[model samples]
Target: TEVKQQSESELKHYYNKPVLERKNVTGYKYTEKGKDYIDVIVDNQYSQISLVGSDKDKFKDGDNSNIDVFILREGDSRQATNYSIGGVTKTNSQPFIDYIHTPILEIKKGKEEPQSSLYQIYKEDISLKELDYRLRERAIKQHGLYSNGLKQGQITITMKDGKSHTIDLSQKLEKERMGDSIDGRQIQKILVEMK
Candidate 1:
């Protein structure tokens, strides 16, 4: 309970925005700037966010100043009902309300497949389905440039362009039968792969 109070004040900042600010970040850039910029992954649970546009500051020279105030979490996962995205209302000065966000993901595909991601096979004897559960749990145990968990989440991929697309990690890995032996080495497959 006390720990929760501390995180209340511990908001992580990036590009003047809460790295855990939210998903579908309109602040970052991609397909814009006349090139292909990479999306920004705020945290390890893979709640992805990408640049949609400028801060309504069009025809500008470049970016601006803002971000969070972090070493702890900004919200919950399993039961959080609608997290925040950095909006303090009607305060006096400091008009620059830097930023704030939540889950719900969009994705991309057309990249390679997941065979390379499947390594913990043969005698390892693991379950990929259960693996996702452990991996999700392990996420609490683990960013961007590229967000990630500990050793467990080392190689899946997600992307977006006209729409959103994600590399079918679990879908690919799920090919193995239930209760079948999977390779422990393949644990890295849980990590995100940028495309």
Candidate 2:
């Protein structure tokens, strides 16, 4: 009886503290009339909190079938990202979640005599015959630019008319292999006209 009362007291103390400050609290198991039902741990150092439900606990999947892991933040009222394991566990389902949050591409006309502009393009933007050469040329240029700690994948050009052209570089290699004329010089000439 004394041990049970002490455990209850500890649980209350932990519950009163902020989640971020509960780093020292160990796993707390729950029981009703001596039958364990669930276990919870608050690990602040690793920024992880876990809850494991025993078979006696409600919900699907019998036995040790329910386990939940959550990531905690310092000052967030809403629940952080969480994961469930066991008990009719979820599987790899698409459309899978994409974690990469690349910012939207923004381009604006420069205010200068030459009117400089920056253009971003993907590998799929280059023409087939020019794809290999452009990729190699950019790699060599990037090697030198990388020394200054700046990454480069976009193209820059100077134009007096403020007009840009779009090129589709996709499927160039496959097309060339099928006997299409791949002209590296023509591609270079097209790009130079952008200036």
Candidate 3:
């Protein structure tokens, strides 16, 4: 029911240098009882993202290759949650700002053709809300966060349009507009129309 595609070789890095240097570079080895550390870092805005490890990694890059954590600060001010492709954990001292987690998908490569057979499965008028829900849930479960920023569990919502959306309570942040907002609701920006 799903398609497979090979991933492009894209190398990205995040802002976990302090932890990475201390753990990976300083050569902190993990024992059977020790927990392997993954760090994810995002900027104040949702414009840039990066990953700082190899694909061979398990917690950071394997079957369940996604990191989910909440960005938190002192006095309980929630920032923004993020979703990306890699593994990174959270710490209590850090500000509860954002969270991110990579998605689970099958990768397949196309030979000689740019288009993939998977394209056949593309549907029209598809609802993105469902996908959003799944992403949020996975983030909460694996990273330990509530959906309301004060709760301890995730929330699942089904839209009236038959769409579903999910969110991690622990990773929840105050909503903001990225420029376009109509009556506080986000308005899609139509960048261009091509022939």
Candidate 4:
């Protein structure tokens, strides 16, 4: 039983926009019509996420008072800002991105939380090989090229003693510093605590 949490990169690719690295924005995964879908959910305990439209919606949370698509459906991605909430329509949103089908559903608190294998933020132990790949990916995005001209990056590795070791990310990966087992909390702003 496992759920794959889509990181910022994956959400950015799907939303076709710059998804900010925020803790509130989360997703719920499900399968429909033989295709997989992630009902984009927000942590309403922190922020109230609402959607209003007469179309399919993915912007909903499990802890919502009104959940129209408990069986989340795949939405149209081509269209932008088709849903409205708080008497205002979104400027750049997909069809199911915001569901105004019944009512602009707003996520509240103390509701039935989502229970699915693929509906939670995933965590895993990362290796140097994958860590290097992720590091370079972010490097290219920020610095524009692969070169030492890039600024040095820092990472917090989970230690065996349950402590965290914050170190500079560089070619030192080949040293005896890192092993193959380390907890990676893959998150926004790319927190790479690789081992």
- By lDDT, who's the top model here? 4
lDDT per residue (tens digit) for residues 60-165 in model 2 = 3223322222122323245553221111111222232221222122222122122222323221112222322333234234333223322223332222344333
Q: List the residue pairs that clash in candidate 2.
A: 125-169, 126-169, 128-172
- Model 4 lDDT tens row, 1-195: 353433434322322322212222344434455533334333332212123222124323233222221111123455432221111111212333332211111111123231211112222333333333344444344433224333234544344355654445433333233223344333222233211
Q: Name the best candidate (by TM-score).
A: 4
- Model 3, runs deviating above 4 Å: 1-125, 147-195
Model 2 off-target regions past 4 Å? Answer: 1-135, 138-143, 153-195
lDDT of each: 0.26, 0.26, 0.24, 0.30
Candidates in order, TM-scores: namely: 0.19, 0.16, 0.16, 0.26
Candidate 1, residue 160: Cα displacement in angstroms equals: 28
Residue 65, candidate 2: alpha-carbon lDDT: 26
Count of backbone collisions in candidate 1: 32
Q: Which candidate, 1 or 3, has the higher TM-score?
A: 1
Off by over 4 Å in 1: 1-123, 140-178, 185-190, 193-195
**Which candidate, 3 or 4, has the higher TM-score?**
4
Q: Ranking under TM-score, best-scoring first? A: 4, 1, 2, 3
